[PDB]
Every structure is written in C-alpha cells, then in structure tokens.
Design a protein around this nucleic acid. Sequence first.
RNA 1: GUAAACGAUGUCGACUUGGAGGUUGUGCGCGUGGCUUCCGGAGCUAACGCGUUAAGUCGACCGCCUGGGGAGUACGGCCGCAAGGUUAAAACUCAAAUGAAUUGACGGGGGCCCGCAGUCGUCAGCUCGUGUUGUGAAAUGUUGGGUUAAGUCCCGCAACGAGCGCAACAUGACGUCAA
RNA 2: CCCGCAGAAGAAGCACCGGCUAACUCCGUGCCAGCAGCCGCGGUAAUACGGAGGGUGCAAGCGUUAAUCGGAAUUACUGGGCGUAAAGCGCACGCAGGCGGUUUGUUAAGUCAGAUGUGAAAUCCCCGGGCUCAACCUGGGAACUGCAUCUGAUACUGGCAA
Lengths: 129, 154, 79, 200, 114
Amino acid sequence: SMQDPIADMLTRIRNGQAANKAAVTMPSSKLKVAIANVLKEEGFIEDFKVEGDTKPELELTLKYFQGKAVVESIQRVSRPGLRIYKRKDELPKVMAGLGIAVVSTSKGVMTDRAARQAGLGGEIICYVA
Amino acid sequence: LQEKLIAVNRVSKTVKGGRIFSFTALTVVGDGNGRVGFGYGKAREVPAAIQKAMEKARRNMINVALNNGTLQHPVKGVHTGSRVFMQPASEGTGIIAGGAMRAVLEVAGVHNVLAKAYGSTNPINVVRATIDGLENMNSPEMVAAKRGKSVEEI
Amino acid sequence: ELDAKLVADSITSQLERRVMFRRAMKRAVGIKVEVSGRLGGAEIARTEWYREGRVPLHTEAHTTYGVIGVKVWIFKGEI
Amino acid sequence: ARYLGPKLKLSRREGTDLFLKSGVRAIDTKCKIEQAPGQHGARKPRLSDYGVQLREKQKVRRIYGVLERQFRNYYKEAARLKGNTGENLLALLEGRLDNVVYRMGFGATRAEARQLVMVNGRVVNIASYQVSPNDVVSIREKAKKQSRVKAALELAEQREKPTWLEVDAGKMEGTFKRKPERSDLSADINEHLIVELYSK
Amino acid sequence: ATVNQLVRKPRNVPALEACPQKRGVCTRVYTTTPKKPNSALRKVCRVRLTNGFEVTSYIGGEGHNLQEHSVILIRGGRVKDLPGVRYHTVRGALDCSGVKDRKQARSKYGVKRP
RNA sequence: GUAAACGAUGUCGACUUGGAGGUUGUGCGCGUGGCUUCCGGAGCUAACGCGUUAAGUCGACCGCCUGGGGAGUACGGCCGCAAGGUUAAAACUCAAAUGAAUUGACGGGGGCCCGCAGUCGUCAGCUCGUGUUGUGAAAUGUUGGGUUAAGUCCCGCAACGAGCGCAACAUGACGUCAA
RNA sequence: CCCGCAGAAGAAGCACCGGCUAACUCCGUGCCAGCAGCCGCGGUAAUACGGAGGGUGCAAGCGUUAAUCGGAAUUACUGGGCGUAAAGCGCACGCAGGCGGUUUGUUAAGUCAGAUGUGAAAUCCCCGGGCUCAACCUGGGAACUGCAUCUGAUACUGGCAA
Ligand SMILES: CN(C)[C@@H]1C(O)=C(C(N)=O)C(=O)[C@@]2(O)C(O)=C3C(=O)c4c(O)cccc4[C@@](C)(O)[C@H]3C[C@@H]12
Ligand SMILES: [K+]
Ligand SMILES: [K+]
Ligand SMILES: [K+]
Ligand SMILES: [K+]
Ligand SMILES: [K+]
Ligand SMILES: [K+]
Ligand SMILES: [K+]
Ligand SMILES: [Mg+2]
Ligand SMILES: [Mg+2]
Ligand SMILES: [Mg+2]
Ligand SMILES: [Mg+2]
Ligand SMILES: [Mg+2]
Ligand SMILES: [Mg+2]
Ligand SMILES: [Mg+2]
Ligand SMILES: [Mg+2]
Ligand SMILES: [Mg+2]
Ligand SMILES: [Mg+2]
Ligand SMILES: [Mg+2]
Ligand SMILES: [Mg+2]
Ligand SMILES: [Mg+2]
Ligand SMILES: [Mg+2]
Ligand SMILES: [Mg+2]
Ligand SMILES: [Mg+2]
Ligand SMILES: [Mg+2]
Ligand SMILES: [Mg+2]
Ligand SMILES: [Mg+2]
Ligand SMILES: [Mg+2]
Ligand SMILES: [Mg+2]
Ligand SMILES: [Mg+2]
Ligand SMILES: [Mg+2]
Ligand SMILES: [Mg+2]
Ligand SMILES: [Mg+2]
Ligand SMILES: [Mg+2]
Ligand SMILES: [Mg+2]
Ligand SMILES: [Mg+2]
C-alpha cells in the first residue's frame, strides 16, 4: 500500500524530469504544498498550483535550463521506516551548500540554511540538488 | 599537456598456431587547469600501444570546473564495477588518492583532494569513474544559472 | 645507408656492439629485415622481423651468446 | 645514530648536489654527480611511483643528516601544526639550530658543524633545537682559535648567505628574524611527495 | 537487510595458544615429500608441546641435529608445500643447533657472527 | 511434506517513451477496462540481458546471503509407521571455487565445398594502418548474395585502404611439430 | 651541572636486493641442497637456493614469531547484496510486531530551542610555561558528543476527539 506520500511526490518529480515532462500532477496535501513552496522559492520548480476541494490535485511545473533538468537529484531522507531528526548544529549541507535539505521545523517547512539562521533543528524531509 | 601512463597490460588471443600476445596502454593527458582526457591504445609492441593511447587521450578531453586546485563539492563517480568518492580538501593536503585516480586528478589540475575507490579497482574503469565524477561536478555559477538566482543567493 | 650489404653489416656489427636488436632493425627499415638467434642473450632463441612497403618475393653477428643470423630484402622498384 | 659513511654517494644516488661537501674543489672533479653509486651505476631504470616518493624523502633527509625516526616525528609535527603540512615540514627543518652553525659558516660541512656542537646568550649543544623568530644565535669565545672555523667562514663567504638571517663578523652572531616561507627555499624539493609518502 | 531486521537481529597457529613461541619434545623426526609441483626431502618433526598439543614442525636451513626426545622451541609459520605443517623450529634455541656455515641472514638461522 | 515445487525473479502500492499480437468484458470505424504473449526505447546490468507483467525510478514489511570444500553432514530438539523431513554446527583442508562474455581448438553438432579420399600444403589462406563498435578480452574490415582453381572477381555492406599469399612476370604466405 | 687531563683514542650492527617492494652481478649447486607472506623459485649460463662483490632500507638496534585494529564497502548504521556469481520460504492465510490516505481541533510522548545542574582528576586536543632540546613535567582553556530537570516551540511523527 501507499505508505509514504512525500517519497511518492519526490519520485513523481524525479521521474517527470527524467521523462522531460512539462508538469507532474499528484493528490495534494498540506505537507506536499509546504514542500512545493520551498522548491519554488529555491528555484528548482517553476510554479505549482492546487485544484479541487474534496479531492485536491497538486500540479508542479518542472523547469529545464540548457536541455538538462534542473533537479539533478532528489532523495527522501526521513522515511516512515526510519525517521531522521537533526539539531541545529548537525543540519546537513547538500552538495557543499549548492543544494538544499528541506527541513520540517516547529516554525514550518524550510531549507537547511533558513533553519540554521532561525536557530532551529527538525526532521530532514529530503535532499535536493 | 602533462601526460601520464597509468597501466600497461599484456593481453592474448589464441590462434591455430598458438597464442598472439599484444599490449594495451591506459594513459591520461591534461592541461593542469581543469581539462583532462583518457586514452586506451592496443598494439603488438608496448611503445606503439602508448602512442595510440596518447593520441586518443588528446582528442577525448573534457572540461572540469575546478576551485583553487580542489573540487567544488563531494562527488561520486561510477563505471562498471568501479565506484569512486572524491571530496574537496584544504591546501597542503595533496592528492590523497590511489594511483589511477591520482594520475587523473594530477593532470586535471586537482592539487588537493581526498578520494577513495570502492568496488573494482580495475584501472580502466576507475579512470572512467573518476572522469565521470569530475565532469558532472557543478560550480556555484551554473547552479545559480539553472536555479535562476545570484551566486550570493546560492 | 641504402646498400643492402652495408645495412646488413650495420646490423650485425651493432649486435656485436650490444645495440638492442629492435633499434638496429627499425633503423635498417620496399624493405624487410629478419634477425634470428639468442636475441638479448635469451636462452630461448627467437626470430623477429619488420617489413615496410612491398616485398613481392614471388614476382652473421658472432656474439657472446652465439651466432645471430641477419637477413635483408629491399624492393627498389621492378626490372 | 649518525651516517658516518662516504658522503658523495648520497648526492650521486639522489642525482643532485645536496650541499654535503666543504667546497675545496668542484663536485664534478670530486665525483660523478651524473652517475648513481656502485657497479650497476651507469644503469638508470624506471623508478616506480613509490620509488620517486621515497627518493624525494631521502633527498630532504640526507642533506641534514636526520635519521628516519626523527624525520617521521617532524612530519607528525608538520601535519599537526595549522596550515600547509609540506611547508610546515620544511619550516621545521629550517628552524633547526644545527643547520645554523653550518649555514652561518662555522663548520665546513654539517658533519663538521655537528662535531663543533649559544642562543639568546645561553649555550645549546642540541642539533635539533628549534630556533624561534627574534632569537640571536652566536658562537663562544673559547673555541675561536680553531683553524676549522677560520676556513669554514671563507668557504661560507663564497656561497649565497641566507635571506632571512643576519650573520656578523668577529663576535660572530645572527638573529633568526622570521621563519622562511616556501618562496625562500629551493623550488626543487617537491615536499607534497613526502606528505603523500607518510599519508600512505 | 532492512533496519527493522537489523534491530531484530544485528550484524592458523592454534597450538601456540597466542604465545610467540612454545617449547616441545620431538616424538618423531623424518622427511616428507612436498606437494606438486615441488620435489625434495623436507625435514619435519612431530612435536608434543608443553601445553599437550602434538604438531608437525618444519626444520629450516641446511642440516639439523634433532632426534626423538629433542627439546625445541617452535614459532608460527606454515610451509606452503607441506599440507598440515603450520610451525617452524627456531634454529639456535635450546637443543636445536645453529645452521652450520651460514653467513647471510644469520639471525634467522641461529648462527653467531664469524 | 519433498521437486530444476523455476520466471532459478517475495508480497503490496506509486511513478516513467513506443510497436505488434492473443484472450475476455463494455461505450459511442472510433473509444474504454481486465488478464496475457512477443519485440524494443530511456534507464539499469559484470555481461548475458531486463525493459509499464522491470532486472527502471521510489516507499512499506518479510525471507535469505557472506570464499570453495567438510555439509544441508554430525550432535541435540521437534515431526514421521517407515522412508526420512526440519532446525543446524565444528575440527580439518585448499588459494581458489564461481558468473558472464572473448579468441581458438574440438564434437560420434548443422550447412556449404575440395583432393586418386622436411612437414601440414601450392592448402587459400594470414595480417596490418586508420576509422568505427565494445567497460574489456576483442570485433569489424576478411561476414553476406553470386561466381571462381583461387580472400578469383562482381555486387552489397561502418568501414576505408594496404601488405604477404592467388594470378601474372619452377615458384612453398603468416605460422605449426623445442621436427 | 661546571672546570681540567690524555689521546681517534674505548664504541656498528641487523634485515633485505624475482614481482608485489627501495636495491644486481659473478661463482657453487643442478626438482638436489634448499627458499617461500602471496604468486612462485630450483631438473647445467638461477638477479628467487648457498657464498662473494656491489647495492637498498633501518640503525644501538635490526629482524622473526605472537597479538589487535586498519586496508576489508569482506556483517555494509554511516556503507553491500539475492534472474544466471552465495542468497526469494513451494504457495497462502494470519496473531504478535513494523508501517500507515486525507481535513480540523486538541495534546505535547517523540522531535526542536533555551536555561540550570551534573558529566572526578589524569589522559586526548589547543594556546602557553619549565627541564640546554626532546621525551617528560606543568598553567589555563577546549572537550567530555552524555544524562537529568525546568521553561518554551508545534512543522513533522505519536496520543485523543470529530
Ligand atoms: C556455543 N554455541 C551455542 C554454538 C552455536 O552457536 C551453534 C550454531 N549452529 O550456531 C551450535 O550448533 C552449537 O549450539 C552446538 O550445538 C554445537 C555442537 O552441537 C557441537 C557438537 O555436537 C560437536 C562438536 C562441536 C560442536 C559445536 C562447536 O558446533 C557447538 C557450537 C554451538
Ligand atoms: K618445482
Ligand atoms: K558485451
Ligand atoms: K516473507
Ligand atoms: K573454510
Ligand atoms: K582495426
Ligand atoms: K546498509
Ligand atoms: K501533533
Ligand atoms: Mg572506446
Ligand atoms: Mg572486490
Ligand atoms: Mg635512538
Ligand atoms: Mg527445497
Ligand atoms: Mg511446476
Ligand atoms: Mg515453467
Ligand atoms: Mg528457489
Ligand atoms: Mg491467471
Ligand atoms: Mg525486451
Ligand atoms: Mg539431515
Ligand atoms: Mg536431526
Ligand atoms: Mg580468415
Ligand atoms: Mg587477393
Ligand atoms: Mg566486403
Ligand atoms: Mg604464382
Ligand atoms: Mg625495484
Ligand atoms: Mg649458474
Ligand atoms: Mg599479523
Ligand atoms: Mg569494516
Ligand atoms: Mg557483495
Ligand atoms: Mg549453479
Ligand atoms: Mg545461485
Ligand atoms: Mg517463489
Ligand atoms: Mg498475506
Ligand atoms: Mg498519517
Ligand atoms: Mg516533549
Ligand atoms: Mg575530566
Ligand atoms: Mg496529529
């Protein structure tokens, strides 16, 4: 059964980029939208939008630069079978700072850089580069 | 271009009469400034094999975005059974790598690096894994470019 | 340098003077050059040869290790 | 604890002048600097990557007469210290006092200078003493009637005297002003080979 | 293996008894043939050690002085071409004499300096 | 209570170019479901291959592996009327065992030809450069359709050329048998 | 510790040199004698055995054996595999266990933040100091990644309610 919707979102992006899809759609959730917001603000995806009400669908517009997909890697870190939490000092650097780690903190989902500047740890959702 | 001979190997094919020995030569060439290529040459004599390898190496060179004679970030490279890891190091570290990886990194112009070869250490595949690792390494500028940000934002 | 006898003598005398046999042979090289014997003072005697151009055939160094034969063919046109 | 053997062979094996002779006459007239020592000397095979790294380490050792245990301890110190390890290592060898007695010109060779073995006006008879910035090194009075020290200074006066030190006549003293940078020393030592050899 | 599986279930010289040498008494002294591709009369001996283990030991160098009831010091070290010979006798220790007329690697054959 | 009980491929879910079939529903030649077979793309793979029925990209949980032997054996337990099954070691011994693929050679494998059916053998072979393919040994060229006494010649062809043989003007290619 | 006396005088060895691995020749031997960490070497021109000459490495030590970790990503948490190399139970149902679609509220167990207490000294590390130097001794710091308590945060996971 479906036991990790976030890993599914990341995979839809990974597989979408590898297949040169313009957009990818999926069942929405508040956490998926929170992650989509971070990906947009850091410039990994172009745009997102939620459509529906009873069964909302999240669409992500993927971005390509010089033919190549911009999301070169995207990996689930914390997962249902093994949750991963880090203190502020132990927050991971992705690609020596050139990538992002998405972190769920008590002040919402944000990048590792924003968590570190806010002085927060949290759950490491995924690495993006 | 600096040129380095990594490995020479005697190979054999059988014929009606007996065995026909020949030689293979694996070489790397580089400008010492983020340009590197490898060549693999085969001939009945060792010096002919090396010459063929060096000619191949000069025409199959790729560009690597260096930083101060070290890498931009930790990189993984894979080819066949060879899996390599390479990490940026501080000045005065030197090339902390095995011989095949060392030859590549030296001619490429990487002075400081920590490396490790996992899986098969077969030179032919280690060199391909290493160059594969280097060529897909991102600089901050191209990251900034693809993400549509400034480098200070990155 | 061209005359087949002088080149044959150039090889044999060089093998007596401890020149590496491939160096003498490649310098000699339509031409073929064979050298056969205990080459490099090998216990196993071997034959080696190099050709360049056409040699259409159908159309002695007295070393420390023993006798090494040398043969030269030069095709310098027809007739 | 000392190499007390024929000295020219070292420079011959290394294939470079290691500054191990007095200089009464030329190195070429003394020995074959081109040729490696021994019966199989005019031979020169390919040397391995290991063999190259070894010969660079044995070069930097054999100049100073530092045996392996003591040389290894310098590497460890150089790696420990902040900054560039290879540069730190040369700085530590240059910081030695027994270089200074020779370098200032009191011994004809380092072997002689070592037979002859004051810093900040205190007697120090230790070859391995690390001389610091702003330290005054000097000679005694009791052994300034030796002809050795007279001759050695005349040998020293033909060399290029060092360019971070201040040797003086008579009272015969000089300040270690600063530690040398890598720019000061010979661009010939490839000290990264020594760093790599001990990293092995 | 999954994390849950790992949580449930996590990841040649025996007669010396981790001593550098053992003393022993020769119960038989003989020669044996090496395995292929070698040919020689290799000098071995069965030895009862002070800990009660009985083992075959090799006698190295050119010519030896060991009988039954000779008291020898063995060390570790197999002989590749004698299967089941895992120990060497120390030359120039206890009864076992130094090798006669050795001049190189003397310290390995118990031979005092000429 | 075991089988090469095999797809030698655990179950569940999601995602990711195509082509041709089979079978079984269903809506208006055109759709839309289920099950199934063959080919193949990216990707993956040591290679062979797999390829929306993944061996691709991911997530959940389980089972299992840790050199070849000794050994799925001994001992103990449990099960069985028995045959035996199941759980499952150690001493000891070797520096390999193994997988896939490559060039030969070989087959009481297949196809097509030839010969009164020093040497092989006057047999028609044997190679190289450069290019290209393969991680690589290597391959291609030299295979294929014809034709010839002949790698002879023609035509096609990721090969393009060249050498030694063939032929032409007795002549024995590269090599084989430590002959 | 210092000063004086006499005279190079009283003071250099051990392993190695076929590849891995820095260092090669001659003589003796002839699958013998022997070597060997691994591959291997020795049957008449042995850089591999034994001696010598030369050489390389260490040096008041040098070798050998034993033993631990490393290299070994070769038990793989970091960090591996299971079509054919070792590896998918013959197939299923299913208790314990692990995991759990989506929304709101609540809680604050996990998680996160801060504070406080503790985490002996020595050791390690850093900057200094003292023995002529060094080892060694030593001042202050850092560290001791932990544990507990209190006060907060509430995204995510868990509990509860709808
Ligand atoms: C100590 N421990 C419980 C061991 C163990 O883990 C075993 C295992 N299969 O994992 C045993 O079989 C183990 O439990 C066990 O049973 C052992 C033995 O039966 C024997 C027997 O019977 C005879 C000789 C040697 C053994 C042995 C060394 O294999 C024994 C080892 C035992
Ligand atoms: K043998
Ligand atoms: K292949
Ligand atoms: K299962
Ligand atoms: K075993
Ligand atoms: K070719
Ligand atoms: K793992
Ligand atoms: K909650
Ligand atoms: Mg290629
Ligand atoms: Mg391996
Ligand atoms: Mg000492
Ligand atoms: Mg079974
Ligand atoms: Mg069946
Ligand atoms: Mg079947
Ligand atoms: Mg099975
Ligand atoms: Mg069915
Ligand atoms: Mg297919
Ligand atoms: Mg049984
Ligand atoms: Mg039983
Ligand atoms: Mg052919
Ligand atoms: Mg022809
Ligand atoms: Mg053709
Ligand atoms: Mg003819
Ligand atoms: Mg060597
Ligand atoms: Mg001999
Ligand atoms: Mg050990
Ligand atoms: Mg480990
Ligand atoms: Mg494995
Ligand atoms: Mg099998
Ligand atoms: Mg199997
Ligand atoms: Mg099955
Ligand atoms: Mg079930
Ligand atoms: Mg949930
Ligand atoms: Mg809490
Ligand atoms: Mg403490
Ligand atoms: Mg909740």
